[PDB]
Structures are given as C-alpha cells and as structure tokens.
Amino acid sequence: GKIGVLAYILQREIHEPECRHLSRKFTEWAYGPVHSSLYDLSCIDTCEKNSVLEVIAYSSSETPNRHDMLLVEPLNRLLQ
C-alpha cells in the first residue's frame, strides 16, 4: 500500500543519457496542457506471478491505500 512509491515508480521518467532505459514513462509530444505518454506496463498487466493489478486486487484489506492505488494514472486508464 505504499501509494507514493508506487506512483513514483509507475510514472518514472529520467532525462539523461544512458539512463533513459530505466524510465517507465516516456513523453512523445506535448502541445498545450495536453501531452501523450507511453507507460511501460511490464508487470502491471501480466507477468509470471505478481502483476500489480493482481497484487492490489487480491490485497488482504489491511493495505492502507488499496482503494486509492488504482487512481494512479496508468492503472486507472488501463482498467477503464
């Protein structure tokens, strides 16, 4: 339920040489207030065992931000 760390990781963008591959969010274009990103979605949608969606959905209900963690941009858009 570490919503802050999760929101950081899922939206991480690193603007420097030799570390762009570490990013998970990539900005293609941005005109006004509107901009189009690409999110990695490795281990969010599907993976071997612990997809993020599967981990959140099957949380034990003691997890603090289980309700709010799905508001993080890539997950909310992916689920919709």
Rounded least distance, CB 25 to its own copies, Å:
9
User: What whole-number distance in Å separates Cα of residue 49 and Cα of residue 16?
Assistant: 32
CB of 27 to its own copies, least distance (A): 10
Q: Which helix (H) or strand (E) holds 29?
A: strand 25-30
Using DSSP, state whether 70 is helix, strand or coil.
Answer: helix
Residue type, 33: P
Q: Kindly state the smallest distance separating residue 9's Cβ from its own copies, in Å.
A: 15
Q: Which is nearer to its own copies, 4 or 32 (CB)?
A: 32
- Among 71, 69, 72, smallest CA distance to 24 is for 72
Which spans of this chain sit near its own copies (rule: CB under 8 A)? 18, 20-21, 26, 31-42, 45-46, 53-54, 56-57, 60-61, 66-68, 70-71, 73-74, 76-79
